[PDB]
Each structure stands twice: as structure tokens, then as C-alpha cells.
Design a protein around this nucleic acid. Structure first.
Lengths: 84, 53, 53, 154, 83, 55, 124, 50
RNA sequence: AACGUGUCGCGAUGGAUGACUUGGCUUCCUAUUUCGUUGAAGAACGCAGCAAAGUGCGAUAAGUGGUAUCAAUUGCAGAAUCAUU
RNA sequence: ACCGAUAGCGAACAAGUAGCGUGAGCGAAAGUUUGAAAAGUACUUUGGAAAGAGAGUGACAUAGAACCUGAAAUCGUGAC
């Protein structure tokens, strides 16, 4: 109960916290340079639900076909209005 | 303005009945209170609006 | 849904000097054997359970 | 603890009370009683006397099979006992009261007991194994004692 | 006799403690935590014992992480720090 | 039992699947309906708002 | 018109659950008539240091300074009001804000700042 | 028996530390409903079993 | 003399009672729907000044970090620490 | 327009705990000082000790931590 030591250890938490923060992000950077892979381990690459990790990436999902596309061009439907 | 309104209303009537009102307000004795009926009171005179403004 | 109603309790039957009801299953509890399910029992059903319509 | 009976004169009487004593209550009743219990004069001397020169203590309530004794002559009856345990208590009891008679200033050379009130205090539990596995309580009856002493005079 | 001596004979220790769920029911020789059914890669429950099911049903622990999922999801992943 | 000459032997709720201390089960009350009404309404209106240029 | 409670059970519950942070908020004082008059605030939340007056309770009318603010029991110890412990030791009593009124406040930056908002909300 | 695995070694240890009067200093605080060291294990009553 | 009987006042005895009542218990809503082998849940044991428990936490162990706010915390500890960063 | 601590969830409580059972599983009991607060009875004094008696506190301790009330059964007492 020269109680002050708790804090000091808690200070220890603080360097330590920081430290990895830095390292970790260090790492992250030097992973890239390709759109993918190994850039950056999973533990650098942050969990996000089974489903959330699953999912259709937008390109492949919005990048539908010519048939439709032409069609889409052909049948837009924005505003009309009626009453009289 | 509340006051303006009320006053006339009082003058024109609202005093007793109104005064029963607000003031016959009691904590609901018994358990309804403890099923959240904390207070009770009576009822006093009615103005009908065509609509309020 | 099934308030009260909840031990794996059984009726003990006859010859046992006693009213013939369900009783709590288990020992030590010192609920051990205590009358079960219904109405009359501690924490039990009540008669006529409280219907939805 | 509002113990006992409304007791007179703030001048010359003295109050104590102790609880849950460890002698069998009924029994103790008969212990207490000889001092108190009764009927005035007989109760007063005898406490001064068993307790300052005698043994058998009278009983006349509890039943059982309960032994017969000539000592019961002390009573003209047939029951009294000599049960050690109690006795001890009794002595204590007087005694604080007596030291209080210093502080009240009363004459301890001749104080008198009036109105003791001795009550059943809540009982002690424990268990026993019987054949086939049955179990019974073998329980206990302790004591409440609260005491007053008088000694006005001419 | 029939019983009590034979109560002398209960040095079975029958079922022991478990890994996954602990308690007991661990049959040594045909190896099972009755409970968790460790061995087996899933865990056991049955209907009838519904209460047991409740007794095991998640949260009872601490959903150590999963708990936090609710925060996080609700915290909708605007990500990184503000600075 | 009382003497009253009334409309013979009836009344019904004391039949099947009305979940008792058992459980069951096929449940579908309408008490939601206020709320539901609102659910239809509140939504409906609220929908309008969104759509809004549209007949 | 929303025509009820604002239901007590829940509410009643909530109060008991007040966190530290929250205690401070809830606790506000009537401000000195003069002080009110001065900064033109309605009522104001406390903290240490400062000066108060006892209105009601059995002990109506006692007055003194804030030593100590014990939020869990919701207490102010005010300086120079105390109780004696049998031994001969004074032990301060504690107290609730609304039956006291703040006579005088400690003002730092934060104070000044807070004060500003408050004073404003009354005054501006 | 004579020998009794580390896990086993753990179970007593963990328990023992709990089997004694609750930290009194705690008890003293404001609003301490605190009856007693409830859950304390014992042996001439309460073998831990198995 | 006895035991009973009785009253009442009073006392014991007991934990009733009412009154409360963050408890239960029901209905109804919102949602930027809802895990985990990227190791979930559940499990284990651990971690405090002084902690049994609970509770929190996980050897960064009754915790750090950010951010928000803006002086407490009090069983006893502790710190002058409010122009304060 | 629910229940009111034997109610009400099992569970108002360190409860799905404790406890119990080989195990499967079974699975409880258990509420409130303060017209305001410990002010939680200093001190005296007897008392081995508890303790007592005083005292001392506090509106109130027929409020002294069994704290609201304190029902009945049962018993001492007083009193007859």
C-alpha cells in the first residue's frame, strides 16, 4: 500500500499499448501492393462477421449485363405526375 | 396566452369547477398507484372547439 | 407460459399417510418432495390459469 | 426489551437481565422459582440459604417419571433436584445485582428479591440417526432471566 | 448389507470430470462426457430436458466477444480513430 | 346447478391448442391490430412521403 | 397531448441507478437569491468548496461551506456542521441539495464555462 | 490416492483461497448488505468429491 | 398447599401484518439483424492496496486506449491535484 | 383496471447460484434502522468472559443492527 505502483504498472500498459499500435500499423502498410493477398494477415485484417466476411462485392453485383443495360437505357422511369 | 384565455374562462365560469379541478388531485391511494396510477383527480367543464387555435 | 409449473415432480400416491398429490422431485433442496404443479402449492399454478382470450 | 412487570420506586429497587441461558428451561423454572415463583418469605430466605449453605432445589411442576426424594420435605411435596448446572447461574445472577446495590447504594446485607421473571428463550437444534435411516431432532431449551430486587424498609 | 456394505463398494469414481463442460459423467471406458459429449465435436441436449437447455444456452457464459458484437455492429463501422 | 332455461349444452373455449401448461400453440390473435393498423397506416403515409412525385 | 407517466417503476429504478457523472447533473442547487440575481441563472449544479444554507428538514436554518461532496450517498459535508461521535469525535453530517441553497461558488475555467451556459440559458 | 494431476491440484487451490472469511476491509464500507463468506468449502462436512 | 381455571396488564415467545416494493409478470415499438476455424458459444483458470464473493477484467488481468465530459472516489489508502496540460 | 415477498419468474437476495443426486439430471431457501443520520451507545462500574447494571445516544431504542408493523398458536409473569 504505497499504492502508487498500480499506476506505474498501468503506465506500463500504456507504453505497451502504444507500442504495438505502432508496430501493428507499421506492418499493415508494408503489406499492400497488389489489390490483395498476404497483404495483410488476418490479424491484420480484421474480423467482420461470417456473413459480413462473406458477401458480394459491389462490382460483381452492380456489374450486370448488356441485355439489361441496354434495356435500362431503354426503360428509365423517373417522374411523371398525373392529375389533370 | 394562457392567462388571458383562462381568465376569461374563469370569469365566465371556470372557477369552481376548475378549482375542483387541479386541486382534487390526490395521489391515488391504494395499489393502482403501484401499478402506476400514482395520482387521481375529478373532472371539470368542457369547451368544445370546432378545432383548437 | 407455464408459470409455477416446473419440477420434474410426481404424485407420490397412497399408503404414505398423506394426501395423495404431486410432490417435488429431488433431495437436499428441502423443497424435496414439496407439493407440486398446481393451485394450492406454493408458487404453483393457480386454479384456472389466466386466459389469453 | 420491555421485560417483565412495571416495577416500583426508582429509589430502591434494582434491575438486571440476561438471556438464553444454558439450562433446561422448565427445570430452570423450578430453579428460579424457589427464589421467586411463590408466595413471599419462603422464596426469599431459601435463595439466601441454598445459595448460602444448601443443596436440593425444589420442583413442583414438571412431571415425567420424576424421582422421589425426602429433600422434597423442604417443600412438603416430592420433587426437587439438585441439578448442578443451573445453580451456578443462579449465583451469578444475584451477584451483579448486588454490585449494582453498591452503586444504587442499597444495603446488600439484606436485599430482597421481588419479581423475577423467568421466560423460555428460543431453542437449540441438532440431529440424530435412527434405524433405517430415520432422523430426529434432539433439541434444546434455554433460558430467559430478568431480575428485580427490593429492599425498602422501616 | 445389500446396500450399506455395498455402499462400501462404491469406490467407482465412475464418471469423472470433463474438459469442455466439466462436471462429470465421464465414463472412462467408453469415454464420454455425458454432458458435453466431449468427445464428439458438437454438444448434446435433448428436448425434454428443456431446462437444461436453458442451463446451457448461450449467455450463461459470457459470450466473451460476441457480446461486443452487438456494440460493434451498432457501431456500424465507421472505422479507424478520429484524429 | 342453477335453473335457467336459456339458448342447450354449449360454450366452446375448453378445446385444442390453447397453449395450457403444456404449450400448444397455433397462435394468431389480432391484438396486434391497433398497432397493426398503425402499422398499415403509419407506414402507408410514411411511404407516400418518400415517393413523393409519384401518383 | 401525451396524457400520463412516465412510469414510475422504471423511473424510480433509474434514479437509483444514477452514475457518478449523472449524480452531479441531478444535483443542483437553488442558487442564492442574490447569486441568482447576480448571474441570472435558475438553479445550479454543485461540486466542492463552496457555500450553502439549510432550509428545511428537522434542522431548519443551519448554514455553512462545502467541504465535501459524496455523491454516492448524495451528500455534502459542510463545513462546521457536524455531529459528535460518542467518543468525542466530530463526524460531519452529510446532505441533499434541494433543501440547501448555494450561497457562494468556486470558479475556474470550467466553472466559468459551465456557468456561462447556465447563466445564459436563464439570462440571455 | 497418492498422485492427483495438476488440474486437480488447481481445484483445491482455487478453492482454498475461497474457503475463509471474506475480506473484512471490504465489509465496512458504505451500504454493505453482506451477510458472510457464503460459499466457504469444508471437509468433515463437504468432501469435494471425485 | 396442588392443578386447573380466569382476567387483565405486561412481558416473553413468533414472524404475522401492513405499508412499501429497481422483483416478477404481461402487451406494444425501434433495428442503421443477428456469431464463430480470422478460432465462436460454451468451458477453464486466472488477474485488485488491502478482494471471499459478486462484479469487472485477462499476464496490457477489478485494467490500457480513444473520445466525450469536467472532481471526484471514501472501509481504511491515495494524491494538493485545479490557470489543470 | 397484473402480482405484492408462501405473491409474483425458479430466482426482488453474490440464483437457475446454494443444495441434492452416480449420472442422466435434479436445482432452493433467502426482502425494508434513522421525525435525518450511526448519531451504531463514549464513559462508569460490576462482570473470568459473555455480560450486567449504570451511564451515554437518539423525537422515538415498545427504533440499539431481529432494525416498519409485529398477527395467532404456544408460555412465564402480574394480578386475580
Amino acid at each position: 500500500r504505497l499504492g502508487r505502483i498500480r499506476t506505474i504498472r498501468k503506465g506500463i500498459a500504456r507504453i505497451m499499448t502504444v507500442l504495438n499500435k505502432n508496430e501493428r500499423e507499421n506492418l499493415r502498410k508494408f503489406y499492400s501492393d497488389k489489390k490483395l493477398r498476404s497483404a495483410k494477415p488476418k490479424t491484420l485484417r480484421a474480423k467482420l462477421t461470417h456473413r459480413r466476411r462473406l458477401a458480394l462485392k459491389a462490382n460483381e453485383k452492380n456489374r450486370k449485363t448488356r441485355r439489361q443495360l441496354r434495356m435500362a437505357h431503354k426503360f428509365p422511369r423517373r417522374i411523371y405526375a398525373v392529375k389533370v | 396566452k394562457t392567462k388571458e384565455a383562462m381568465t376569461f374562462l374563469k370569469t365566465v365560469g371556470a372557477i369552481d369547477d376548475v378549482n375542483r379541478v387541479n386541486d382534487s388531485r390526490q395521489i391515488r391511494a391504494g395499489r393502482g398507484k403501484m401499478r402506476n396510477r400514482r395520482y387521481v383527480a375529478r373532472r371539470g367543464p368542457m369547451l368544445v372547439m370546432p378545432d383548437n387555435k | 407460459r407455464l408459470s409455477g409449473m416446473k419440477h420434474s415432480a410426481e404424485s407420490w400416491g397412497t399408503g404414505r399417510a398423506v394426501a395423495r398429490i404431486p410432490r417435488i422431485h429431488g433431495g437436499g433442496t428441502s423443497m424435496s418432495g414439496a407439493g407440486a404443479f398446481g393451485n394450492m402449492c406454493r408458487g404453483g399454478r393457480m386454479f384456472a390459469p389466466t386466459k389469453i382470450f | 426489551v420491555h421485560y417483565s412487570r412495571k416495577p416500583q420506586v426508582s429509589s430502591k429497587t434494582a434491575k438486571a437481565k440476561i438471556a438464553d441461558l444454558r439450562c433446561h428451561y422448565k427445570n430452570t423454572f423450578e430453579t428460579a422459582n424457589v427464589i421467586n415463583g411463590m408466595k413471599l418469605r419462603k422464596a426469599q430466605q431459601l435463595y439466601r440459604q441454598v445459595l448460602a449453605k444448601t443443596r436440593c432445589i425444589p420442583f413442583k411442576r414438571y412431571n415425567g417419571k420424576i424421582g422421589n426424594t425426602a429433600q422434597a420435605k423442604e417443600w412438603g411435596q416430592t420433587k426437587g433436584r439438585w441439578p448442578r448446572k443451573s445453580v451456578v447461574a443462579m449465583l451469578s445472577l444475584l451477584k451483579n445485582a448486588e454490585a449494582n446495590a453498591i452503586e444504587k447504594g442499597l444495603d446488600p446485607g439484606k436485599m430482597v428479591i421481588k419479581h423475577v421473571q423467568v421466560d423460555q428463550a428460543p431453542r437449540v437444534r441438532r440431529r440424530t440417526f435412527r434405524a433405517h435411516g430415520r432422523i430426529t431432532p434432539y433439541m434444546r431449551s434455554p433460558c430467559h432471566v430478568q431480575l428485580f430486587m427490593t429492599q425498602p424498609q422501616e | 448389507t445389500k446396500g450399506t456394505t455395498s455402499m462400501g463398494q462404491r469406490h467407482g469414481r465412475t464418471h469423472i470430470l470433463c474438459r469442455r463442460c466439466g462436471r462429470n459423467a465421464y465414463h472412462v471406458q467408453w469415454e464420454r462426457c455425458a454432458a458435453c459429449a466431449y468427445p464428439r465435436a458438437q454438444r448434446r441436449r435433448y428436448n425434454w430436458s428443456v431446462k437444461a437447455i436453458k442451463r446451457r444456452r448461450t449467455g450463461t457464459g459470457r459470450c466473451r466477444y460476441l457480446k461486443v458484437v452487438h456494440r460493434r455492429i451498432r457501431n456500424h463501422f465507421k472505422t479507424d480513430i478520429k484524429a | 346447478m342453477p335453473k335457467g332455461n336459456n339458448a342447450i349444452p354449449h360454450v366452446h373455449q375448453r378445446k385444442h391448442w390453447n397453449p395450457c401448461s403444456s404449450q400448444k400453440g397455433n397462435v394468431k390473435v389480432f391484438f396486434n391490430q391497433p398497432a397493426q393498423k398503425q402499422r398499415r397506416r403509419r407506414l402507408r403515409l410514411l411511404k407516400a412521403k418518400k415517393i413523393f412525385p409519384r401518383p | 397531448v401525451g396524457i400520463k407517466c412516465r412510469n414510475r417503476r422504471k423511473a424510480r429504478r433509474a434514479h437509483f441507478q444514477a452514475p457518478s457523472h449523472v449524480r452531479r447533473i441531478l444535483m443542483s442547487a437553488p442558487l442564492s437569491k442574490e447569486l441568482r440575481a447576480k448571474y441570472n441563472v435558475r438553479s445550479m449544479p454543485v461540486r466542492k468548496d463552496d457555500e450553502v444554507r439549510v432550509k428545511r428538514g428537522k434542522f431548519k436554518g443551519r448554514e455553512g461551506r462545502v467541504t465535501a461532496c459524496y455523491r454516492l450517498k448524495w451528500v455534502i459535508h459542510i463545513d462546521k456542521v457536524s455531529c459528535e461521535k460518542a467518543n468525542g469525535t466530530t463526524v460531519p453530517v452529510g446532505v441533499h441539495t434541494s433543501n440547501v441553497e448555494i450561497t457562494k461558488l468556486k470558479l475556474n475555467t470550467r466553472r466559468k464555462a459551465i456557468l456561462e451556459r447556465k447563466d445564459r440559458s436563464t439570462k440571455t | 490416492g497418492r498422485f492427483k494431476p495438476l488440474a486437480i491440484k488447481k481445484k483445491y487451490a482455487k478453492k482454498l483461497k475461497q474457503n475463509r472469511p471474506v475480506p473484512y476491509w471490504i465489509r465496512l464500507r458504505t451500504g454493505n448488505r453482506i451477510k458472510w463468506n457464503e460459499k466457504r468449502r469444508h471437509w468433515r462436512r463437504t468432501k469435494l468429491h471425485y
